[PDB]
């Protein structure tokens, strides 16, 4: 989820 | 995003 919440927007 | 927030944990 790291990656995803790095994606963020 | 719904489709992934769907995965919440």
Three-class SS string for chain B?
Answer: CHHHHCCCC
Residue with the two structure tokens 């995965």: B7
E strand or H helix that includes residue A2: helix A2-7
Burial of B3 (0-12, 13-18, 19+ CB in 10 A): exposed
Nearest to A1 by CA among B8, B3, B1, B2: B8
Cα distance between residue A9 and residue B9, in whole Å: 20
What is the DSSP secondary structure assignment for residue A5, as one 8-state letter?
A: H
CA B3 from chain centre, in angstroms, equals 5
Residue A6: burial class (beta carbons within 10 Å; 0-12, 13-18, 19+) = exposed
- Which approach determined this entry? NMR
- C-alpha distance across the termini of chain B, in Å: 15
């Amino acid at each position: 989820e790291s990656q995803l919440h790095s994606n963020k927007r």
